[PDB]
Structure 1
Amino acid sequence: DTDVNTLTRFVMEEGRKARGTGELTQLLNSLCTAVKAISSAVRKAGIAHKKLDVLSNDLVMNMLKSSFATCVLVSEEDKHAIIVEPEKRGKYVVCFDPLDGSSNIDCLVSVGTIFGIYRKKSTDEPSEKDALQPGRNLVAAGYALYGSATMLVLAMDCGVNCFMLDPAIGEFILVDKDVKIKKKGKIYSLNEGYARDFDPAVTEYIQRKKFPPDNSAPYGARYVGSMVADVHRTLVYGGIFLYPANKKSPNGKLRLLYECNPMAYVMEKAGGMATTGKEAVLDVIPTDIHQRAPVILGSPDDVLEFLKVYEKHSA
């Protein structure tokens, strides 16, 4: 139409509401350019003119440094933090997973991009330490799901806002404003293929869902295998998504900073819940930028059910 409400307009508007400097708007525009390019790359993965995780990491990194908004960056496919050139520093710390779960291009890719944005609190010259914040300090968080439509979900204080990429103009158009997740769902999501390294809490919760004690309808099961896809489904349809310990640690597999914290934040801003079993995910204070966390997230009543089973039939 003639009054197209794009992502950049939306961020500019709640940012004018917030009397801010618009540095975050530059940051999110850079992210959007990276996401559009990654989307069109995944488009045509099997027409090789690969290395897609590396190329996505580089693309995101350069756009963020060129945003004039970031000063410390953290990546899944990079080892320690990267201190943005003083020539182009900003007030923001970004932890991101450029690309998650891919590299069988020739007939299949299932991918998404996760990010979280914290403001820099200290006044020291920046280092790794500035990215070591608890997830409750996030200024913004979100993901881009590369599916049958390229979609950006973005969480801020007003809540969670839906965006779909319009290929005809190459802009993200807002779809849903103030997204809320259902109180209780009908779908659970976890890799049951393990099932033998599980906590008895995980087993008894799954059993409650497969053989309901009220003789009610059993929960449907869904597990795409790429995190962002499962989490997005759990945000749209309602339900619970589970990645517990499973022969890794009492700390799970997904990384806290760039995979668990942004999802926890989107979930919380949509009204859902996100725990590790012991403490809420957003309350974990990290000590390594690459440290893993167990994650049980989703609809509030379903996560409360899991926490009851953890309180009684677990350990």
Structure 2
Amino acid sequence: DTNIVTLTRFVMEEGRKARGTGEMTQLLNSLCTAVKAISTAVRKAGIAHLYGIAGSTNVTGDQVKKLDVLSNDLVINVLKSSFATCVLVSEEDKNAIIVEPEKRGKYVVCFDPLDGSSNIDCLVSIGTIFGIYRKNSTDEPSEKDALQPGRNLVAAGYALYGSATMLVLAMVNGVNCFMLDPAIGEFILVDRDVKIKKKGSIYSINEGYAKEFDPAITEYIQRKKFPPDNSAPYGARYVGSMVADVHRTLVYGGIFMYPANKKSPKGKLRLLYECNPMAYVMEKAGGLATTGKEAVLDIVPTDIHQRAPIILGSPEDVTELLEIYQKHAAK
């Protein structure tokens, strides 16, 4: 009651014995501020007329919504002001953003300011995704500082604007969930050291793409619906917002899939600010995250807006699908 374990307190105490300049706390405190401001706009978006498009398109091809602009501006401004960052990569910006010398700190942040664009207008859960790297280079900060493999992440996670607003944060020792208290505008710890189940009973994929799926995905799905051992078939869930489907995978277990297909060699989701952050969360929770052929966190990106296939969740479910890919593997 009068001893609130806030996100700030947790990350300060975490980074205590480990020493540190304390800019990670600065960064996350700043991010939390933009997340609250996004949550409040979202929760009254119809009244504030924030539905509808902005009138523009993303890089490879994406219709930019009003809340994309708002959330993008908020995240960039708070990150800059935090004095903790030097390079920013956003889904909404064609090029990396370089922070001004005076406000530069040591971190590189890749983010999706608003994830779940197709679900905005129907009031389904949407979110914010981020991954944070330490700049390694010694030269002037540049776009290349963002082109690190996922395994180099120091922290990653997401905000979920669902039935409640939740900040899920993964760092080297594990995953923790903080719920926004709307009364005092603080993220409070509600789930400690989260670990995903070894095996789940939900599969999550858009079967609208059945016609384009590779034979391994096709086989796996058939197996969920017609188990060979007479076990009960898996239930299906696909909210359509990566943050919502991945969060459910984390807390209920199971598998989430956005694979490569006949029209999309690399899938749809973006490696730097969608796939890597979630793969990292999953791995810190004891889960797996693969493209079907390689670990997502091991990919070395060459494009900040690069796409990747992703299959993640409970280790025994992801493994079962890898076995099918392996079985189908060819010259």
Question: CA separation of 1:52/1:17 partners in 2, compared to 1, >3 Å: closer, same or farther?
Answer: same
Distance in structure 2 (CA, Å) of the matches to 1:123 and 1:85: 16
For residues 168-211 of structure 1, the C-alpha deviation after alignment (integer angstroms, 9 at most, x for no partner) is 11100001111000000000000001101000000001111110
Question: CA separation of 1:105/1:177 partners in 2, compared to 1, >3 Å: closer, same or farther?
Answer: closer
For residues 54-77 of structure 1, the C-alpha deviation after alignment (integer angstroms, 9 at most, x for no partner) is 110000000000000000000001
Does structure 2 conserve the Cα–Cα contact (< 8 Å) formed by 1:240 and 1:303? yes
Distance in structure 1 (CA, Å) of the matches to 2:114 and 2:262: 24
Measure how far apart 1:17 and its partner are. 2.2
Q: Does 1:155 align with 2:170?
A: yes
Does structure 2 conserve the Cα–Cα contact (< 8 Å) formed by 1:97 and 1:258? yes
Does structure 2 conserve the Cα–Cα contact (< 8 Å) formed by 1:116 and 1:138? yes
CA RMSD of aligned residues (A): 1.3
Distance in structure 2 (CA, Å) of the matches to 1:51 and 1:261: 26
Question: CA separation of 1:29/1:99 partners in 2, compared to 1, >3 Å: closer, same or farther?
Answer: same
Does structure 2 conserve the Cα–Cα contact (< 8 Å) formed by 1:7 and 1:172? yes
Instruction: Give the one of 88, 91, 106 matched to 2:106.
Output: 91
Question: CA separation of 1:32/1:220 partners in 2, compared to 1, >3 Å: closer, same or farther?
Answer: same
Moved more, 133-142 or 105-114: 105-114
Determine helix, strand or coil for the equivalent of 1:31: helix
Distance in structure 1 (CA, Å) of the matches to 2:202 and 2:162: 20
Distance in structure 2 (CA, Å) of the matches to 1:12 and 1:248: 46
Write out aligned runs for 1:172-251 (5 A): 172-251=187-266
Determine helix, strand or coil for the equivalent of 1:116: strand
For residues 243-264 of structure 1, the C-alpha deviation after alignment (integer angstroms, 9 at most, x for no partner) is 0113443211000000000000
TM-score, length of structure 1 as denominator length: 0.97
What is aligned with 1:270? Answer: 285
Q: Does 1:24 align with 2:24?
A: yes
Determine helix, strand or coil for the equivalent of 1:130: helix
Question: CA separation of 1:248/1:30 partners in 2, compared to 1, >3 Å: closer, same or farther?
Answer: farther
What is aligned with 1:33? Answer: 33
Measure how far apart 1:275 and its partner are. 0.4
For residues 272-305 of structure 1, the C-alpha deviation after alignment (integer angstroms, 9 at most, x for no partner) is 0000011100000000000000000000000000
Does structure 2 conserve the Cα–Cα contact (< 8 Å) formed by 1:204 and 1:313? no
Distance in structure 1 (CA, Å) of the matches to 2:85 and 2:123: 33
Does structure 2 conserve the Cα–Cα contact (< 8 Å) formed by 1:52 and 1:103? no
Moved more, 106-115 or 201-210: 106-115
Distance in structure 1 (CA, Å) of the matches to 2:89 and 2:263: 23
Distance in structure 1 (CA, Å) of the matches to 2:107 and 2:120: 34
Does structure 2 conserve the Cα–Cα contact (< 8 Å) formed by 1:159 and 1:178? yes
Does structure 2 conserve the Cα–Cα contact (< 8 Å) formed by 1:256 and 1:293? yes
Question: CA separation of 1:191/1:106 partners in 2, compared to 1, >3 Å: closer, same or farther?
Answer: closer
Does structure 2 conserve the Cα–Cα contact (< 8 Å) formed by 1:51 and 1:103? no
Does structure 2 conserve the Cα–Cα contact (< 8 Å) formed by 1:72 and 1:83? yes
Determine helix, strand or coil for the equivalent of 1:52: helix
Distance in structure 1 (CA, Å) of the matches to 2:42 and 2:203: 28
Does structure 2 conserve the Cα–Cα contact (< 8 Å) formed by 1:102 and 1:110? no
TM-score, length of structure 2 as denominator length: 0.93
Does structure 1 conserve the Cα–Cα contact (< 8 Å) formed by 2:127 and 2:161? yes
Give aligned pairs, total. 315
Distance in structure 2 (CA, Å) of the matches to 1:298 and 1:105: 25
Does structure 2 conserve the Cα–Cα contact (< 8 Å) formed by 1:199 and 1:314? no
Distance in structure 1 (CA, Å) of the matches to 2:189 and 2:39: 18
Question: CA separation of 1:237/1:106 partners in 2, compared to 1, >3 Å: closer, same or farther?
Answer: closer
Does structure 1 conserve the Cα–Cα contact (< 8 Å) formed by 2:214 and 2:262? no
Distance in structure 2 (CA, Å) of the matches to 1:81 and 1:146: 26
Distance in structure 2 (CA, Å) of the matches to 1:138 and 1:91: 13
Unaligned runs of at least 5 residues, structure 2? 50-64
Distance in structure 2 (CA, Å) of the matches to 1:35 and 1:85: 23
